[PDB]
Amino acid sequence: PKLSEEQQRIIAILLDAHHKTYDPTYSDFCQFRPPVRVNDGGGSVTLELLQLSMLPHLADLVSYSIQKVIGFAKMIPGFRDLTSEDQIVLLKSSAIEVIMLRSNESFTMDDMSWTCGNQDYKYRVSDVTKAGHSLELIEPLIKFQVGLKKLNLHEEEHVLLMAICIVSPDRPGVQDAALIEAIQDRLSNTLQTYIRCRHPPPGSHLLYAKMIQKLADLRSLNEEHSKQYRCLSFQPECSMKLTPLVLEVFG
Ligand SMILES: CCC(CC)(c1ccc(OC[C@@H](O)C(C)(C)C)c(C)c1)c1cc(C)c(C(=O)Nc2nnn[nH]2)s1
């Protein structure tokens, strides 16, 4: 097969959008409220909810990340042709899934952590539980990160996957499903063609089907995250540890 001029333009736009919305040096992380790691009885749920020591830092990180996702989405070919109602629905419903995809670049299989520079910005299972989450979310999240890392995606495939994730016509509340489907089909066809033309074997074997499966896995992680966020919101005064953007997107 062959990538058309339009498909190559779409790829060039998305790579550029990524380069403009992802900092591989994590230079802004020092501006977030500082990470706090204290004694909590070996990860006791009770003391983790009493302290929520990692919540202001990780809420700042997710809020920064939603801002970058918004910036990326604005550059997706066709996204600005949608109504403001469809843009909000797509952005709110995909935000945590795109964050999970984005975070894979800093994820390392050496020690199963997200290494964003200094050991202060090295995140593990323990840090997520220190923000109030339980193993029902962080165990399959780690499983997803490893699974995605083993795909060894080209940057072109990585940007196309995040773009396909955002522009999903099957999100609850979407009005113009037909226009969203036409945008995603253009992106999905660009991806299938890219894999056939540029991805060499063995890595290319059933890669499109594996990428689509990661999108289904992301929906299940989104529902679990949404359940965990509701339980965290029952904790008195925890909203003051969040941000207006995080409260709007997840509330
Ligand atoms: C995806 C995993 C992880 C692990 C620390 C994460 C953070 C907060 C989390 O929960 C907190 C939320 O539930 C609240 C309550 C809404 C705040 C959860 C469940 C996971 C992130 C790691 C990195 C590097 C991320 C990021 O954003 N990477 C980026 N962005 N830009 N450049 N690098 S996110």
Numbering used by the authors: 122 to 164, 216 to 423
From the paper:
The vitamin D receptor (VDR), a member of the nuclear receptor (NR) superfamily, orchestrates calcium homeostasis and bone mineralization through transcriptional control of VDR target genes in various tissues. VDR is a ligand-dependent transcription factor that forms an obligate heterodimer with retinoid X receptor α (RXRα). Helices 3, 5, and 12 of the structured LBD serve as the ligand-dependent activation function 2 (AF2) surface for complementary binding of co-regulator proteins (e.g., the p160 family of steroid receptor co-activators such as SRC1). Agonist binding in the hydrophobic pocket of LBD facilitates AF2 to adopt a conformational rearrangement that facilitates high affinity docking of co-regulatory proteins possessing conserved helical nuclear receptor box (NR box) motifs (5′—LXXLL—3′) that dock into the AF2 surface.
